[PDB]
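okkk here we go again. third time trying to get the cobalt (II) ion bound version out, last two times i messed up the smiles copy paste (missing a bracket lol). double checked this time i swear
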Amino acid sequence: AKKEVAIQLYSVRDILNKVDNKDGKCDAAYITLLKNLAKMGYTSVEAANYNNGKFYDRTPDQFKKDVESAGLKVLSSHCTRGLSKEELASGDFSSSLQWWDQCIADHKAAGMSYIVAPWMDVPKTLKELDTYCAYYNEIGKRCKQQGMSFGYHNHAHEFQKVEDKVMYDYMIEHTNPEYVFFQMDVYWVVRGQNSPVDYFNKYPGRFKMFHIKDHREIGQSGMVGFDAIFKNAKTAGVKHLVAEIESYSMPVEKSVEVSLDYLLDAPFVKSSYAK
Amino acid sequence: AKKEVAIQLYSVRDILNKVDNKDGKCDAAYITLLKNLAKMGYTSVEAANYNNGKFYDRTPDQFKKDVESAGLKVLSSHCTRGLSKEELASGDFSSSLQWWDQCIADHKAAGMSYIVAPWMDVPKTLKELDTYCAYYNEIGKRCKQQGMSFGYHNHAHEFQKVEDKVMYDYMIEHTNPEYVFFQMDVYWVVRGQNSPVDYFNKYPGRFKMFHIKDHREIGQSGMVGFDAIFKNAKTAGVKHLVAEIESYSMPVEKSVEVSLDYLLDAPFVKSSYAK
Ligand SMILES: O=C1[C@H](O)CO[C@@H](CO)[C@@H]1O
Ligand SMILES: O=C1[C@H](O)CO[C@@H](CO)[C@@H]1O
Ligand SMILES: [Co+2]
Ligand SMILES: [Co+2]
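finally!!
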């Protein structure tokens, strides 16, 4: 069964952390990995390495060619830059936006459709969280001006309160839906004691990507109600699914492949969310 | 689709807490409730009220007749009695076992197949937890001598450590499988940050009943991977499913019925676990 599913490359970090694309080289193990991921049936990647204008020590144009030639789309990337104490205090985030301009140019050239902040710290005050919301709106606008969408990926910590407000809820309510979506990591929502579906119903259309992760292999633990999540996918607004596997019951590549196979065999997972 | 599913009567406590079966009466609202639960398609009940030799102010023989005449089996009951500081210190739990003798006689007469302790406190030491394990073994033996099985129902607190050992694991490892099973409340395992399936694989056959609960209606939240749980049901050793619904999106009776309908429509829920 062919379905659109991205792989978060963090899932294969054990291979990718050791590949040597420095000093003009292209590591055959890097290319082989990409080709194997396509052969498993992944349709696209989400990067988890962006540093010094490069993805896994490849220029954006190289990364594009590498991924596309393996039969994969360049879908998304996890990267962000936090605000300085200064920026937070002044609310002036010019400095940080300059970095984003370079980040965004690089992502565009790699053929990315999305850029997603993986993490932010729980701030001390709602005022700080507010500044972050404004910064994300502006990053998101710049992404759109360069053909891409910006989103925010959660763990569990966002379900805590800042002053007396749940951080996640506040972030959703104070970001412009045109410019910021939420890449809901459903596993982490459940770990954070919350209901993916209730979030979908309360903020329909904001969850344009899912991170589909589990305790180990996807769909194995009993810890994530994928069936209910997918049944409510229309309300969520999801357009792409990103599989992530960071902890394993078996060899990594095999783990990543059986994880996919869960989604391909699941009758409630449609073959595309972007038709 | 007919399947065997019990209803935990705690789910309809709002009705049952107000019914008047005192002074020789049989409340028509009580009987109607039972009949409605059968009409929804529940096949059996698990009681959540045992006090003064009675179930909802009915003698065991009356309760049996009440439930059975509505078209339901009397499957199980939630009740327990904790040990005194004395009993824990001496390790002599005669006093408590006397109560259990009466409890067990009453359960037998009601036609019960199972008796399940709903709750115990996290003890201070492994020595206390040990005494509890021995007490449960002896309760369980008495239950078997009277034709029934004793089990232990979890929330999330059992996933904490006592000295340096997870309480749940210790309880499982230090109880006799003949005499104590675990009524795994899969929702609470997941809330307690753990994997139902991993518990099944680590302690196959110990989980002879499931409590099938969710945040509100069963199967609605995204918070419980029922599909994976049920796929691994053989390893668990489950023989009966008990639906519980304690928090509602709609009127109680309707909530309880749509909760069931999730299981009846779920292809991974078999029509019986006791064939
Ligand atoms: O799921 C994960 C990790 O839990 C950490 O955050 C994300 C950043 O790449 C990643 O995909
Ligand atoms: O699920 C529940 C509650 O969460 C409390 O424990 C059980 C006792 O009847 C009940 O079925
Ligand atoms: Co993730
Ligand atoms: Co329960």
